[PDB]
Design a binder for this molecule. Sequence first.
Ligand SMILES: Nc1ncnc2c1ncn2[C@@H]1O[C@H](COS(=O)(=O)NC(=O)[C@@H](N)CO)[C@@H](O)[C@H]1O
Ligand SMILES: [Cl-]
Ligand SMILES: [K+]
Length: 413
Amino acid sequence: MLELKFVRNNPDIVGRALISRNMGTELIDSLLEYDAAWRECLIEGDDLKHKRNVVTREIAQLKKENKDAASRINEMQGINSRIKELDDKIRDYKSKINEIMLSIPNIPSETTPVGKDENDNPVVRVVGEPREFTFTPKPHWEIGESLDILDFERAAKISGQGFAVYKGMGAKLERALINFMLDVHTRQGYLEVFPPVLINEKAMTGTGQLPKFKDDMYGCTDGFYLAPTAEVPVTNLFMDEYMENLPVFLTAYTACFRRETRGIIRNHQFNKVELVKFVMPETSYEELEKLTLDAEEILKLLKLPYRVVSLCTGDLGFSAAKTYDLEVWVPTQEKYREISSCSNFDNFQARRANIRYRTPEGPQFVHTLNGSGLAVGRTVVAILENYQREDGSVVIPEVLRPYMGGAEVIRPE
Ligand SMILES: Nc1ncnc2c1ncn2[C@@H]1O[C@H](COS(=O)(=O)NC(=O)[C@@H](N)CO)[C@@H](O)[C@H]1O
Ligand SMILES: [Cl-]
Ligand SMILES: [K+]
């Protein structure tokens, strides 16, 4: 969430932010009405609480001077009743202000381009040259079923639609990618952590998934949610702390769960290796450029042609101030497809989760950043498509061979 005082003082900064996201400004209008009622009730109640303290002492003084106190004791019943009414209103208004503040998206950065949707996302850079095929490439689901390394029919029987079972060299490729990704990020300076994927409500609120995106998440017995991304458990590790040794760079593998495209492009469960940073505010714009480079290094090392796109205001996520997407080439679609989002959140998540650090002039919120390095299933799609042979077998990218016993090609078994 934003800072309430800042929204009060700059309603047309915030309102134009919400129009740039294709929203109206009704939430700001509502917020400022409830805020004004809170402020006026606090003034009236603080005055009456002071008066009740004085009248209590006046009654004591009248009793010591042997004077009748009945008119004062009468006034006190009215004071006490009006105070109770004002406190009940203040309780209601604060609850309404908190609900509204948790629903207002982050302010887009000054370098986020203005646009309405994904058609207005500028291309930042194009890296690598897409393969020129001499035969007609097959999509990843046809290659995976023919090699018997992806099983959709048996996944549907145990789970349902939108799942996959990896088998044999498919399972070994996914495992090799995760190991490779975590090893490279370790060399880049990230600390490997492995957290749970059952998340409480406070953590899911902290990164912005709740309350707005509750219906997109799996909820579980005992009040838990399944993580939609390692962003949720990892970022919230430092909830209600003062952080040390900034910047802090973490990386994690987790399974990811989303209620929600063919094959493994869009599934209810998928694997992802995430990058998370906690940094001092003046450094976060450069930390985003550096995190993006750390994520795209995986694509460069795997020799998978890609491009980097800048998300416009209309396509930006709720909690993000600035995002770059990595988009990998998909031969059968003759287009690039999202494989990562890399974002700066400014202090939006840090305010929600109370993640601060000490400065000589007092405490400040950290900035948080994250990015996919990478979604593993979509990397398997990009390998099966871009490394396929005319015979339907798939060449194993050179960097993964040491993680696969020196295997060079996935063939039918
Ligand atoms: N349902 C899904 N199935 C498979 N892959 C997915 C699905 N949803 C997202 N992805 C992949 O996961 C990446 C990260 O998801 S994200 O929502 O864009 N961003 C995040 O979750 C951030 N925490 C950065 O990882 C995507 O860019 C996409 O490549
Ligand atoms: Cl306007
Ligand atoms: K939007």
